Amino acid sequence: SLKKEYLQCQSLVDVVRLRALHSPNKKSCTFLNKELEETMTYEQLDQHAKAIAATLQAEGAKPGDRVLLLFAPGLPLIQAFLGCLYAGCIAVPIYPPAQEKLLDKAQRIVTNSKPVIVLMIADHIKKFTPKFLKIPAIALESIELNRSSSWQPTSIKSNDIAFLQYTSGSTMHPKGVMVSHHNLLDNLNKIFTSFHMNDETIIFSWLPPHHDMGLIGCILTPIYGGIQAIMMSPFSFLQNPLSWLKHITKYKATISGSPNFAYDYCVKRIREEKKEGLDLSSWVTAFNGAEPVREETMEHFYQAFKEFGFRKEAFYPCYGLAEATLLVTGGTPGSSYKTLTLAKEQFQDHRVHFADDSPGSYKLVSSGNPIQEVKIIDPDTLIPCDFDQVGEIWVQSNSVAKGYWNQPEETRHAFAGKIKDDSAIYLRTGDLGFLHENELYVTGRIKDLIIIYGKNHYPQDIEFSLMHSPLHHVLGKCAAFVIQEEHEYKLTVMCEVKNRFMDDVAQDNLFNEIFELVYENHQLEVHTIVLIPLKAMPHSGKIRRNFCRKHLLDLPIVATWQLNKI
Template sequence: MEKLIDNPTIPNSNYSSMINLLSHKAMIHPEKVVYTFLSNDNQDETNTTYQELHMYAKQIAAYLQHLGLEGQRALLMYPSGIDYIKAFLGCIYANVIPVPVYPPGLSRNMLRLKAIMDDAATNIILTTTHLHSKISFHFSDELSNMNLKWIPIDDISHDYQDQWSQPKVDKESLAFLQYTSGSTSSPKGVMVTHGNILHNEAMIKAACQHNEDTVMLGWLPMYHDMGLIGNILQPLYLGAKCVFMSPMDFLQKPFRWLSAISKYKATISGGPNFAYDLCLKKITDEQKRQLDLSSWKVAFNGAEPVRYETIQKFAQAFKDCDFKLNQFFPCYGMAEATLFITGNEKLTKPVSKGFCKESLLENKAIEQPINSENSVKLVGCGMTWLGQKVEIVNTDSLSTCASSEIGEIWVKGNSIAKGYFGREQETNYAFNNIVKDTNENGFLRTGDLGFFHEGQLFVTGRLKDVIVMRGKNHYPQDIELTVEKADQAIISGASAAFSVDINGEEKLIIVAEIERKYRPRPHKERELKEYLDNVLRNIRQQVMEEHEVQPYAIYLLKTSSIPKTSSGKIQRRACKNAYLNNGLEVWHN
């Protein structure tokens, strides 16, 4: 550590751990504000500097070392805010393995929490005194036999920071467990090392052309990889600043997000595609007149399919706020690769192409005019960075695909995690795979399908979600987009298409949430039934016309009832399980 202090210009690539990184940033930027948390409708700010963050991390780490927890795993259960970051880095400084989780608000969240605790083999939970009391009150029955060890860190004595002993960790050391957004019964903990984080942050920096003057603005959940690696740790890696708010503050009022970008002159911000759709839906013309988005150079869009219609409409809707289409930064990534896999070049217009619908069904990507009648519009997710390698592999032969052939996306590089904690069989399947025709090993199987075209990676869907009917592949997100465009009652980003076996034949099932104003009411039951019957007809007709497949059943669901991941992605398998077990919250079918 002393050698770092002798060299204040040490490049980030030479750091051996996240401890070295923050220690050094605190030395060269002691008084610089690293995090600003917004609350109370963006009126209140909570700030912390690099030096304060370093001291908090040492204080928490020393206490955890005092408890003898080094090398153990501990759940981090915090509301959005700077306390979460302090706890995460405190664990890192103590070589305690943090496991970010979402505080339970519903019984189904408690089931997921218990599944994560069992999988991570821990009963230790770091939290705040207030949240501990709140959870203990609301979930007293569920917690009574769980033998939990709660560690509130908001009342740790400052005296502990002088007792901190820097642990022996390096790039190969496990930094944290990132639990994937699977079904509640089987979440998997991705083992992310210090070296994984440092390499992934370097790739993000290179792709986005970041530096110390970068201003990040975020609202993404900190227990999710895009929020943690992208929003929280990237500014730390840069020696830059991050302004952030809670996900709920954004969801309740999307204007808060763009207003904060305008106010703080943020240079990078973003989220999944649905976030931009929500802005289009909720932000008024009067609110737009208050916005200046000219500073926003990287509007990243990832974690779910990037929709051509969304980026076009957003650029058009906010052009008078000085937002341009080339500010969009489509990207692709996943927790198993730490976060970032591919991304476009900064301030380069997104590559949007049209591909023959029939050819895509047969696993071939044949370009045609984007606005032609039989064209599927796809947005490229950029290219690889810093030597990371992506191959498109045939899932039958496990050899590289021919040009324009759709296959599974395989990734190799220093960002690829070490596997799934305690799951040798799943790790052996997903990690360190060999491409047979080149005999090159070390590849991660992403489970995603895609192809390269003119140097851009195009992602077409999840391998396990593809619907195969009568020998043709149907991508569920394409059907879902058709469903959402079929009627104004359908909520954007809240539908799922999947298949089930009916008497030995695959049949298409569609579920979709509808706006609250269309829910059944006693005094308008007949009128609403007629309207919802018409919605069903519209969906059926549009799906048959555009995809040449007949839906077996269509269900209109209650608002906010469809299963989603922590980043807002539809959980199609969970939807299918709910359908098979009569667990859907249906309003009309």
């Protein structure tokens, strides 16, 4: 548990200063690049932060100013994040754009947040420019540690905004969640406590470090709690899922996790023979959150790795979202997570229709107990639902964020939930679910998810990615779309292939390359890939798309790949 002197700090900045004073040589973060290891102690993080803050100050940045960070995974960008905080500037972490000229998302973020400076690694100054989208750019490599002594401390307030975190999927009109210093520490504390962390905790992570779980859970929480973080890049996991498990083994990581898909992805790609040497016994919490959590995924993963020390006990479903900083519900670590079986037909008043383990039934996994206050509320009447009745998940706590940057009206729709009639104020999540036995079961979204993929232009942009990647040389036309399938949504990609007789080796190689490309460009996961003969698609990307959708439902297929199927 955190010592009192750390609990008493009013910002993450003061926490880091204090750990740098009291345990300067304690190792904090380790970043892995292939076989290479780079490490950073509290003393080093603190010194780099000061040097970085000093530079921002010398360049004319004032408290409250936004500073953009091209978040290449690594220690430098972590240093940059703290450096912003040390200067009282609002950090704005973004995924560095996958392709040099595909900058639209970054541009929208730049226009929204209006940063005065952007920080990035030397390799990116090259790729991207000095100015980046009209914003003056500074290479992190150029900030000399000598500058540290010139840092002038600011007077940070609890309610001051520490950083913006842009939601995962509002790409056409990005929402920058405003996370205050008080928000951040409240959620870090709930994470450290709820996950039963201690002095010996070791967190391993490959997750995108610029937002939600990969930032708040896997970097800021360890730094806050005085425990080790060990990390590699998402690209590394995507290219070789096995590395996740090899690193947990070598480092004896105790806590690591991911969205649900990643457990399936290990099952799908890791062959029996390659598992030799794995020892997952140290892994006591394997958290599963950020998307719908599936029993089948976890059962599959458990049987694929139980012979290598993985315990089903370790699986930890959890629920949260950026507007609530991060963690909202979660269970007790080491406990078996619960499931419920629902009948095929549900009730129109959204009450829950349970079934015996009937023949059209389906299972929902619990995302745990409310860590933040959770109320299930009717999104139309604003009247509380009964238990075992689906309504909107409303959240209330000190972790609830301050709004969406520079968006008063959009903020009004999400952050000003009032129950009829009476008094508290709630975040409205957009999410549907029900409480049962004080466990939250998330059931879906208010917004039709097909209609939301369509709004962010995902299928269209994914088709473009495929056509503009080197994968094009072996394909014909392609189509991406979301199909709703027995209580699940699946992102489906289908491609004409030049060689209808490529072997099983080529098939698998191609499936893997397509999954990796779509994650690289969109950090989205394809659930189903369909291969078909050249010319099989009609000579509109729209009528082209709807043909693929309609005839998959009722054609010539060369091969099908399904992420969650063994």
